[PDB]
Structure 1
Amino acid sequence: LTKSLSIAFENGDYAACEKLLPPIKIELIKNNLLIPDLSIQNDIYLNDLMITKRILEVGALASIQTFNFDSFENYFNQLKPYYFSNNHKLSESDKKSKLISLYLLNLLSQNNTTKFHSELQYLDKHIKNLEDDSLLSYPIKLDRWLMEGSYQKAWDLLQSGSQNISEFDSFTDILKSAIRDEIAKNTELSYDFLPLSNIKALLFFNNEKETEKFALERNWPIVNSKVYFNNQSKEKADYEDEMMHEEDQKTNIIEKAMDYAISIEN
């Protein structure tokens, strides 16, 4: 039963894994009653906690490859307090290291630098030198080059990531796209005109035609080999200008006298 799931992963059919997980979830109630829920550990209790973790682990990994976000987050959520508890006795593994890396790469891909830095604080002591930086190194490096804003370094790391892919590709493909939107923003404020070649080179497209295609999707017209960033940007501000929140946020000079008076006379 519990072992059927472990062998289903190695087989390679990761859809078999998923169909089998609603039955094994019922058995996960039993494992939970066996452990005292993290309230004292003994040698009866270390086995029990171990089985609970194995089932979750092949599920964590299967979900990732099948792009099934939900399951990964949950399984992982559980793994996190279990590993965090207690002193070493078997509460770290090779599987831990891989799992946290993949997790941090999801956060970089959603572009939520807010949670990533906080998550790193929670993790900190465990990944300092007791898992070290080996696989966990991949997002740490990645954060560093895009903060500096050398997009050249960042980009290079993802392509060279081909020799590191083990299931890392589910965040890596996405992280290219994220790079294209950040750069796209920048280049507007700088200038209005880029040739065709230059647009391709900064945004790192491998095809010139794919460049022009991206430009339409980015709501930019490229005409006679020149971008005309001029249209949409102006249009957006004019559109933003009509909304409703809107008087106090915009701030009226009229309002300043009215607010000042009623303060005094109160």
Structure 2
Amino acid sequence: MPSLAELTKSLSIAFENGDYAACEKLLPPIKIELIKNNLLIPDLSIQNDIYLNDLMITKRILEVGALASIQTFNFDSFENYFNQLKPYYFSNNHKLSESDKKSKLISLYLLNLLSQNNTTKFHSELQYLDKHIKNLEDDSLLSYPIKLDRWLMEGSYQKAWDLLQSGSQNISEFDSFTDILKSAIRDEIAKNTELSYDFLPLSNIKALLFFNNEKETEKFALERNWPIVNSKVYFNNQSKEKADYEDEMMHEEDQKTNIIEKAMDYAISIEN
């Protein structure tokens, strides 16, 4: 936004030319100013007021605060801004305070939601959008997170990895997520491999994990706790007893005992 004489104007100009840390310092004083205004929380007393120093101003300020938060690598704060910002566009319906950076925040928000590994939240967000059909398909930006979410489920790790590396969005602020997402996939791929192969070459595992330096692959094989013999990794699919609990599993002994108690349930149901 052009310079006039607010904090709001200066913050938008700063973010564009860099200055991300400076912007994060500015964000609590910027908040303070907003507190004075009653227009910070969105109202349902509007007739349809979408002017600057109504909804529209308040929207623009939150967005810039969301973007600053990403850049600083402060995903929780992004969510805070997003929770605040999100009604302004629409809850179910509102058309008159729409933008194209909207598309990019919600997609950044889906992905942020993905790396954390919650299917239910993901789906829940898609539903929240103004329509099921219109929004999910129409937006280029939205397409990246749905497609990545489908293939992660599917087993098509390589297509999804490849799509993030080559991506347009990778330059921007999918950049932030790329490091988290890479570790998550590579972990899944190492477990598939652990199960499937009795033995496999070291060269093969370095390429599947999406390394091409020998040394890193030795560190990861060790982290995973695999023996390696020369030229080959050997795999042990290596169970232990337990992984939390839930009886029918033995606090103190006997499934036969669980049968005796459940026998009292059906043998009381006879006698009388």
TM range (shorter): 0.7 to 0.9
Deviations 1:188-240 (A, max 9, x none): 33233222122223222222221121111122222323333327334777999
Aligned to 1:127: 133
Q: What's the Cα RMSD here? A: 3.5
Determine the structure 2 residue equivalent to 1:238.
244
Kept after mapping to 2: 8 A contact 1:107/1:115:
yes
Q: Is the 8 A contact 1:155 1:176 kept in 2?
A: yes
1:141 is the counterpart of 2:147: yes
Inter-CA distance 101–252: structure 2 relative to 1 (3 Å threshold): same
Verify the 8 A CA contact 2:226 2:234 in the aligned structure 1. yes
Do the aligned partners of residues 159 and 251 (structure 1) sit closer, same or farther apart at CA in structure 2, a change above 3 Å counting? farther
Q: Work out the number of aligned pairs and report it.
A: 266
Partner Cα distance (1:132, 1:81) in 2: 21
Q: Rate the CA distance shift 1:33–1:64 in 2: closer, same or farther, 3 A.
A: closer
Distance 2:155 2:42 in 1: 48
Cα deviations by residue, 1:145-199 (Å, 9 ceiling, x for unpaired): 2232122211211211267421210112221111111112222332332221222
Query: SS at 1:5's partner residue?
Result: helix
Rate the CA distance shift 1:50–1:195 in 2: closer, same or farther, 3 A.
same
> Which has the higher mean CA deviation after the structures are superposed, 126-135 or 100-109?
126-135
Asked if 2 retains the 8 angstrom alpha-carbon contact of 1:195 and 1:225, the reply is yes
Q: In 2, Cα distance between the equivalents of 1:181 and 1:51?
A: 44
SS at the partner of 2:76? helix
Shift of 1:47: 4.1
Per-residue deviation at 1:250? 10
Aligned partner of 1:212 in structure 2 is 218
Bigger helix share: 1
Q: Percent identity?
A: 100
CA 1:249–1:235 in structure 2 vs 1: closer, same or farther (change >3 Å)?
Answer: closer
Shift of 1:6: 2.0
SS in 1 for 2:167: helix
Paired residue secondary structure (2:238): helix
Query: Which residue in the other structure is 2:185 paired with?
Result: 179
For normalisation by structure 1, the TM-score amounts to 0.84
Alpha-carbon spacing, 1:81–1:18, altered in 2? closer, same or farther (3 Å)? same
Q: Please show how residues 1-150 of structure 1 align to structure 2 within 5 Å.
A: 1-33=7-39, 37-43=43-49, 47-85=53-91, 88-125=94-131, 128=134, 132-150=138-156
Which one is further off, 164-173 or 54-63?
164-173
- Out of 125-134 and 53-62, give the one that drifted further: 125-134
CA distance in 2, matches of 1:222, 1:248: 40
How far off its partner does 1:249 sit?
8.9
Contact 1:60–1:71 (8 Å) recurs in 2: yes
- TM-superposed CA distance for 1:46, in Å, is 6.2
The change in CA–CA distance for 1:125 and 1:58 in structure 2 (over 3 A counts) is same
Deviations, residues 20-45 of structure 1 (Å, cap 9, x unaligned): 11111122223334877133233476
- Change in 2 beyond 3 A, CA 1:265/1:64: farther
Alignment gaps of 5+ in structure 2: 1-6
